[PDB]
RNA sequence: GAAACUUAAAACCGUGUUGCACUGCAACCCGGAAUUCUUGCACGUCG
């Protein structure tokens, strides 16, 4: 390529049902329920991660590749 | 024997990512019981 490169990907990601990704025991005590969800820690808006979205999409493609290859792969 | 500084000058310094892989996930009906019912003549009065 001869050359060092640095290509960039924008785009959105609109929410169609409910969205639900667990927070477990960060914060509480009022307007907590039974399973809350995970949040900024300053502005207090609702956040999506980048390990749950690396990790939803590496898991999607490795069935994707290991059932056209008739081979199961146990790890990353 | 009484009398004349093994002194002067000199950075423990230069280079180096606590870094690489990892879904807060799987299973769960806001469901089960309950009559918009009870009483009521389209009728009375005729130089």
Redesign the pocket.
Known sequence: TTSYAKIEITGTLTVLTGL??????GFSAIGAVDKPVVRDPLSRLPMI?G??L???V??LLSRQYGADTETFYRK?
């Open positions: 639900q990704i667990g927070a477990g025991d991660p390990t749950s690396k990790g939803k590496r898991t990353p």
